[PDB]
Amino acid sequence: PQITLWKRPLVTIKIGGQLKEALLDTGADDTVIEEMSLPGRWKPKMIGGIGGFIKVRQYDQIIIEIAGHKAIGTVLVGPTPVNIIGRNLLTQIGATLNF
Amino acid sequence: PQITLWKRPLVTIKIGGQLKEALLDTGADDTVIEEMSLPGRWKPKMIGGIGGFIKVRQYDQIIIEIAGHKAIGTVLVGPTPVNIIGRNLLTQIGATLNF
Numbered sequence A, B: 001p002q003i004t005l006w007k008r009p010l011v012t013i014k015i016g017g018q019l020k021e022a023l024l025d026t027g028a029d030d031t032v033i034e035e036m037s038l039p040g041r042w043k044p045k046m047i048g049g050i051g052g053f054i055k056v057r058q059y060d061q062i063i064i065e066i067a068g069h070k071a072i073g074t075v076l077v078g079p080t081p082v083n084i085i086g087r088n089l090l091t092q093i094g095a096t097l098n099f
């Protein structure tokens, strides 16, 4: 698709068999989702955003569908205000910015 | 251009007579620039992201040149860690996300 930006670029994602809404976020290096259970081990990570830094749980090699496109990669879990799809998975679904 | 997302989508902007580097950020509703002076009136605002909120100054009807394309709109000024071009100005330069 070609998504304009007059509204937030929200899409449906599917992770752990559950549908969620997430924001396609070219300003995010990494994908960060609200608290949920994921399989396997996690590693610590700190990410910094507009109000400061937060701790998240880093899960690698997680299967996630984004707007109908399959991705398998790193998902950070923590107190993000909205689910955000960052560049690590936007590249997997072939997304580009165009103007 | 077409900008891939392997790296942060940074561009040069011109604002208030100054050249700055900024991030093309589809996850940002509004444009937020590090501290600088701008002409005219402003009003205080709080904006929130990962990490919490910051206080900014809201200036309306500001012209910015973004990668060579002129746009006008609201610019928030305050202690953001990165200059961000948000959707309010991305729309004006015809930016889309494509996959």
Ligand SMILES: CC(C)CN(C[C@@H](O)[C@H](Cc1ccccc1)NC(=O)O[C@H]1CO[C@H]2OCC[C@H]21)S(=O)(=O)c1ccc(N)cc1
Pocket: A023, A025, A026, A027, A028, A029, A030, A031, A032, A047, A048, A049, A050, A051, A082, A084, A086, B025, B026, B027, B028, B029, B030, B031, B032, B047, B048, B049, B050, B081, B082, B084, B086
């Ligand atoms: C979290 C989003 C809903 C909103 N943010 C835009 C987002 O693109 C920020 C934009 C951003 C970018 C760098 C630093 C601070 C904020 N990215 C971000 O927090 O990404 C974090 C996850 O990946 C990491 O890579 C970047 C920092 C980490 S925001 O910076 O909080 C913000 C909120 C409101 C406005 N008007 C403008 C920006």
Ligand SMILES: [Cl-]
Pocket: B072, B073, B074, B088, B089
């Ligand atoms: Cl605006």
Ligand SMILES: [Cl-]
Pocket: A004, B094
């Ligand atoms: Cl349009």
Ligand code: NA
Pocket: B039, B040, B041, B059, B060, B061, B062
């Ligand atoms: Na003004």
